Enzyme design. Structure first.
Site, mmCIF file in Angstrom:
data_model
loop_
_atom_site.group_PDB
_atom_site.id
_atom_site.type_symbol
_atom_site.label_atom_id
_atom_site.label_comp_id
_atom_site.label_asym_id
_atom_site.label_seq_id
_atom_site.Cartn_x
_atom_site.Cartn_y
_atom_site.Cartn_z
ATOM 1 N N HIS A 25 8.214 0.852 3.996
ATOM 2 C CA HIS A 25 7.763 -0.384 4.602
ATOM 3 C C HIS A 25 9.037 -1.153 4.912
ATOM 4 O O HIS A 25 10.108 -0.865 4.345
ATOM 5 C CB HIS A 25 6.931 -1.217 3.625
ATOM 6 C CG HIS A 25 5.569 -0.673 3.363
ATOM 7 N ND1 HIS A 25 4.528 -0.824 4.248
ATOM 8 C CD2 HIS A 25 5.068 0.009 2.305
ATOM 9 C CE1 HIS A 25 3.446 -0.246 3.754
ATOM 10 N NE2 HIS A 25 3.746 0.261 2.573
ATOM 11 N N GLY A 26 8.917 -2.137 5.793
ATOM 12 C CA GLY A 26 10.041 -2.979 6.151
ATOM 13 C C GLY A 26 9.688 -4.225 6.940
ATOM 14 O O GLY A 26 8.519 -4.470 7.286
ATOM 15 N N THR B 37 0.797 -1.220 0.000
ATOM 16 C CA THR B 37 0.000 0.000 0.000
ATOM 17 C C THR B 37 0.833 1.276 0.000
ATOM 18 O O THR B 37 1.991 1.272 0.399
ATOM 19 C CB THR B 37 -0.971 0.014 1.206
ATOM 20 O OG1 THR B 37 -0.240 0.206 2.431
ATOM 21 C CG2 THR B 37 -1.628 -1.356 1.373
ATOM 22 N N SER B 38 0.230 2.364 -0.459
ATOM 23 C CA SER B 38 0.883 3.661 -0.433
ATOM 24 C C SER B 38 1.111 4.053 1.010
ATOM 25 O O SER B 38 0.285 3.746 1.871
ATOM 26 C CB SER B 38 -0.005 4.720 -1.078
ATOM 27 O OG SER B 38 0.098 4.650 -2.481
ATOM 28 N N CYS C 121 8.433 -1.105 9.572
ATOM 29 C CA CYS C 121 8.099 -2.242 10.420
ATOM 30 C C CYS C 121 9.256 -3.217 10.526
ATOM 31 O O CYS C 121 10.095 -3.314 9.624
ATOM 32 C CB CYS C 121 6.880 -2.975 9.893
ATOM 33 S SG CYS C 121 5.353 -2.048 10.141
HETATM 34 C C1 LIG Z 1 4.288 -2.412 8.357
HETATM 35 C C2 LIG Z 1 5.091 -1.334 7.705
HETATM 36 O O1 LIG Z 1 6.125 -1.607 7.137
HETATM 37 C C3 LIG Z 1 4.562 0.072 7.786
HETATM 38 C C4 LIG Z 1 5.614 1.129 8.117
HETATM 39 C C5 LIG Z 1 5.227 2.464 7.513
HETATM 40 O O2 LIG Z 1 5.636 3.628 8.013
HETATM 41 O O3 LIG Z 1 4.530 2.493 6.529
HETATM 42 N N1 LIG Z 1 3.623 0.056 8.863
HETATM 43 S S1 LIG Z 1 2.005 0.486 8.570
HETATM 44 O O4 LIG Z 1 1.786 1.840 9.131
HETATM 45 O O5 LIG Z 1 1.723 0.462 7.118
HETATM 46 C C6 LIG Z 1 1.013 -0.645 9.379
HETATM 47 C C7 LIG Z 1 0.673 -0.436 10.701
HETATM 48 C C8 LIG Z 1 -0.117 -1.384 11.341
HETATM 49 C C9 LIG Z 1 -0.565 -2.523 10.664
HETATM 50 C C10 LIG Z 1 -0.203 -2.725 9.340
HETATM 51 C C11 LIG Z 1 -0.676 -3.945 8.587
HETATM 52 S S2 LIG Z 1 -1.970 -3.393 7.453
HETATM 53 S S3 LIG Z 1 -3.438 -2.918 8.758
HETATM 54 C C12 LIG Z 1 -3.499 -1.118 8.625
HETATM 55 C C13 LIG Z 1 -4.092 -0.493 9.880
HETATM 56 N N2 LIG Z 1 -4.371 0.914 9.692
HETATM 57 C C14 LIG Z 1 -3.560 1.851 10.173
HETATM 58 O O6 LIG Z 1 -2.465 2.090 9.686
HETATM 59 C C15 LIG Z 1 -4.015 2.636 11.350
HETATM 60 C C16 LIG Z 1 -5.096 2.476 12.209
HETATM 61 C C17 LIG Z 1 -5.114 3.458 13.180
HETATM 62 C C18 LIG Z 1 -4.036 4.278 12.958
HETATM 63 S S4 LIG Z 1 -3.710 5.661 13.976
HETATM 64 C C19 LIG Z 1 -4.877 6.964 13.614
HETATM 65 O O7 LIG Z 1 -3.878 5.263 15.389
HETATM 66 O O8 LIG Z 1 -2.337 6.122 13.671
HETATM 67 S S5 LIG Z 1 -3.012 3.953 11.678
HETATM 68 C C20 LIG Z 1 0.586 -1.777 8.704
#
Ligand SMILES: *CC(=O)[C@H](CC(=O)O)NS(=O)(=O)c1cccc(CSSCCNC(=O)c2ccc(S(C)(=O)=O)s2)c1
Ligand SMILES: *CC(=O)[C@H](CC(=O)O)NS(=O)(=O)c1cccc(CSSCCNC(=O)c2ccc(S(C)(=O)=O)s2)c1
EC number: 3.4.22.56
Lengths: 238, 238
Positions: free
Chosen positions: A88-89, A29-30, A130
């Site tokens: 991502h990582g 994802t973006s 991550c």
């Molecule tokens: C996993 C990664 O490599 C990535 C690192 C990055 O900076 O992009 N982490 S992620 O932010 O994409 C991430 C975080 C948690 C879970 C997952 C698996 S996909 S589920 C997506 C969940 N949605 C969210 O990101 C949020 C929900 C509440 C949020 S808040 C307002 O509390 O910040 S963010 C991937």
């Protein structure tokens, strides 16, 4: 001499690799919000007197190449070196737009034996990515030539603990980068780097909690991970 | 409140697991000198006002057991927790006399959610063990549930960088432990833990170099690795 010489003519470079859009081929994802992270690091490091060079959406290859070239520069007149990876990582891995790169490969270019103009100078790697899929649900409150190790003088400021997810908010950026910047703006003129980074740990750990419609990702916490092989105190002034 | 409350009635426990003799079945050498390490930590931590409990030659099982039990104590009246592991090891692994233990298994007993009397309290793990077989040849010179992460308030003071060998001298002990003890003796009354640990990094990286009859292991260097998830400053006094 308990603190690093930070009065060279130049503070140093601050390379920001900002990966937002990935190849569909990767199924990734973006990274909505990462631009805010990028812009915040740029302004923050600019006030610290660093030469900032932003790089957006690099491929695994472009990242290796960028790092190689940068390690091949003459840093003799630079006090330090900062690299910020936003992407991502996974454990030990950072993703280019088209695939993964080993962090070790990136940092190796800077080993004390491979980048002689940085030997004895602090090399900072700040990584928002991550390191796994674990979630943190939290809890309610003799002999004496004169060599130095080649892995010495490195500092790896990780946005999260080993094995864990790293959190990024869509409009304000990653929890870690927002806190780092804020703590730097507030304390870079008085506090040693490690102590500043501990403030960040605290801010991320107390002030942030995930909110998600999906129970599996709702109400989660995060703790950043300071990994130091520094042999001296680091102050962003003199 | 930028520093941990260190004025509870007791500083805390300091568990030292000293594995020197291993089962033939493992094909592992005795850790000559580790006793000097143990004795130095005991004395050093005693002066810091820690309740010290030494444990010699424990089995993988005995270690899991020791940790379970200690995590099950009421630490309400204790300011912190220190555990020192002296043994052979690999990345993420520490060896009992009869086999290896995952470090994560050891530290998980102390997660903020599983050891409620240590929640919000610094948990230090000091580890003298190898993390691989790599050698370092060196170079000549909105929204605000008030939870905290369960992995927070941990500090892992590793004797060496990830993937690398860790050095131990037959008569004086490990390079890392001798330096940690010295630095604690000299600075525990004035310096924040992180800064002390940075002195350790320097001492080990500059004052130590291997000497061996075997070219493969001669003239090698070592850098320790501070891993901090602490949210506050740590002083060994008040
Ligand atoms: C996993 C990664 O490599 C990535 C690192 C990055 O900076 O992009 N982490 S992620 O932010 O994409 C991430 C975080 C948690 C879970 C997952 C698996 S996909 S589920 C997506 C969940 N949605 C969210 O990101 C949020 C929900 C509440 C949020 S808040 C307002 O509390 O910040 S963010 C991937
Ligand atoms: C492998 C480990 O986990 C172990 C950790 C421990 O504290 O026991 N490290 S080790 O010291 O046993 C070690 C270090 C390097 C290589 C090896 C495998 S072969 S050992 C080669 C002979 N030893 C030495 O060369 C020295 C020992 C002390 C020396 S010095 C410079 O301090 O005088 S040189 C195992």
């Amino acid at each position: 001499d308990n603190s690093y010489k930070m009065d060279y003519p130049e503070m140093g470079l601050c390379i920001i690799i900002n990966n937002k859009n990935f190849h569909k081929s990767t199924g990734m994802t973006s990274r909505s919000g990462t631009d805010v992270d990028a812009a915040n690091l740029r302004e923050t490091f600019r006030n610290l007197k660093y030469e900032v060079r932003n790089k957006n959406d690099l491929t695994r290859e472009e990242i290796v190449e960028l790092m190689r070239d940068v390690s091949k520069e003459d840093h003799s007149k630079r006090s330090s070196f900062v690299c910020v990876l936003l992407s991502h990582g996974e454990e030990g891995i950072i993703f280019g737009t088209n695939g993964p790169v080993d962090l070790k490969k990136i940092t190796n270019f800077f080993r004390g034996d491979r980048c002689r103009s940085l030997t004895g100078k602090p090399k900072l790697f700040i990584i928002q990515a991550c390191r796994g899929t674990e979630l943190d649900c939290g809890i309610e409150t003799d002999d004496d030539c004169h060599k130095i190790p080649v892995d010495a003088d490195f500092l790896y400021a990780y946005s999260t603990a080993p094995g864990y997810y790293s959190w990024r908010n869509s409009k304000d950026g990653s929890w870690f980068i927002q806190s780092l910047c804020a703590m730097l703006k507030q304390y870079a003129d008085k506090l040693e780097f490690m102590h500043i980074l501990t403030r960040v740990n605290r801010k991320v750990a107390t002030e942030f909690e995930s909110f998600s419609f999906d129970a599996t990702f709702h109400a989660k916490k995060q703790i950043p991970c300071i990994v130091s092989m520094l042999t001296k105190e680091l102050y962003f002034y003199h």
